[PDB]
Design a protein around this ligand. Structure first.
Ligand SMILES: *[C@@H]1O[C@H](CO)[C@@H](O)[C@H](O)[C@H]1NC(C)=O
Ligand SMILES: [Zn+2]
Length: 391
């Protein structure tokens, strides 16, 4: 029995383009597809979807939806996709989607949502796509927001004005990440730590001014990387070098400073060739393609350790530090322990870690860490090292 202002087929009901204030009651039991878009629905009550055990696609987008009650989606063991975009939701309805291991797609794009609470989507761990796009009024994301989503492949946090990248370490199977249209000032290694399966990353129009040393080294399956339209002047030495599957990169519309620090990039471009980034400065090279720069225009020498490490006598328990500040800040820094273990700002080791400065940090150090440590700095022109022991 088909409802009034709708169009039924076969298991497909179409009730679009009608001034409907609430969901119609007379819904057939055997329906998979259900379109309730371009209507004026404000509230979604508990158990509004009765006996819909065949429902795979439910579409509640482009409405004035303001409230989704507790257990609104009970009795839906077939639900695959759910659309709620272009609505007026001020939060995410955590309790609504109660026990749904069948839900694969979720679209909360373009709502006035203010935050993503701890364990927001824990009730739907089988998610594959999650669209949180155009959340212009978003003000805070929980560190434990994206817990439970171990099967998520796609995530959209575009057009949200994010100051910092939220915690994504929980998402071990992520393959595509949209972060465009944000205010992500600088990019850190730890931002992407634990995203080895990530293939595409989009940081277009992100107001990105700096990328830290070894910021991407963890993303060892990255193929597409869009840093177009940002405030990048330079990139650290050999940022992309270790990423071996990288084949589409957009570097255009950044104020590229073409000094000695760009030569690794011009060489990488000249080599890798994604198949158009131009020098914005200095005036001598303005509008020259970065990947066509030969080395003759530049005078470059080994990197200079402005602040080399001095020897330290330390107590067992207290903090410790061995400095390695350099000219420039883009020059790559590798440390070397007395073990023979090499280290980098990209590394994910507890306690001991190389801060963005280039300095090697400690916390709760032991006496058995005694030995000679060496800072190994490299740029486009050569290698330079300085070494000092700690006790
Ligand atoms: C640290 O101790 C070693 C000997 O154990 C000594 O060579 C060194 O001068 C000491 N450093 C300072 C300045 O206390
Ligand atoms: Zn350009």
């Amino acid at each position: 029995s088909c409802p009034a202002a709708c169009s039924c087929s076969n298991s497909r009901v179409i009730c679009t383009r009608r001034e409907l204030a609430e969901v119609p009651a007379s819904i057939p039991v055997n329906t998979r597809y259900l379109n309730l878009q371009e209507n004026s629905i404000q509230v979604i009550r508990t158990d509004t979807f009765k006996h819909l055990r065949h429902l795979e696609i439910l579409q509640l987008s482009k409405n004035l939806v303001r409230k989704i009650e507790v257990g609104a989606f009970n009795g839906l063991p077939s639900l695959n996709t759910l659309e709620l975009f272009d609505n007026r939701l001020t939060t995410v309805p955590t309790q609504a989607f109660e026990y749904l291991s069948k839900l694969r797609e979720l679209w909360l794009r373009n709502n006035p949502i203010e935050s993503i609470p701890s364990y927001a989507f824990n009730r739907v761990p089988s998610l594959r796509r999650l669209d949180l796009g155009e959340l212009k009024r978003l003000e805070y994301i929980s560190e434990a927001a994206f817990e439970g989503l171990v099967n998520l492949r796609y995530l959209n946090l575009g057009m949200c004005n994010l100051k910092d990248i939220p915690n994504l370490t929980a998402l071990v199977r992520l393959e595509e990440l949209e972060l465009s249209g944000n205010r992500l000032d600088l990019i850190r290694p730890g931002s992407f730590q634990g995203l080895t399966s990530l293939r595409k990353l989009w940081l277009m129009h992100a107001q990105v001014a700096t990328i830290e040393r070894n910021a991407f080294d963890d993303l060892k399956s990255l193929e597409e990387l869009n840093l177009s339209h940002n405030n990048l002047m330079s990139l650290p030495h050999d940022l992309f070098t270790p990423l071996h599957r990288l084949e589409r990169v957009h570097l255009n519309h950044n104020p590229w400073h073409c000094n000695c620090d760009v030569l690794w990039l011009s060489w990488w471009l000249k080599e890798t060739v994604p198949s158009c980034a131009r020098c914005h400065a200095p005036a001598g090279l303005k509008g020259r393609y970065i990947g066509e720069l030969d080395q003759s225009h530049f005078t470059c020498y080994a990197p200079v350790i402005v602040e080399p490490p001095t020897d330290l006598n330390v107590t067992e328990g207290m903090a410790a530090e061995l400095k390695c500040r350099t000219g420039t800040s883009m020059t790559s820094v590798n440390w070397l322990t007395p073990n023979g273990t090499l280290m980098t700002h990209g590394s994910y080791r507890v306690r001991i870690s190389v801060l963005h400065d280039g300095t090697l940090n400690f916390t709760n150090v032991t006496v058995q860490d005694t030995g000679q440590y060496t800072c190994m700095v490299t740029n486009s022109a050569g290698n330079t090292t300085a070494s000092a022991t700690l006790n």
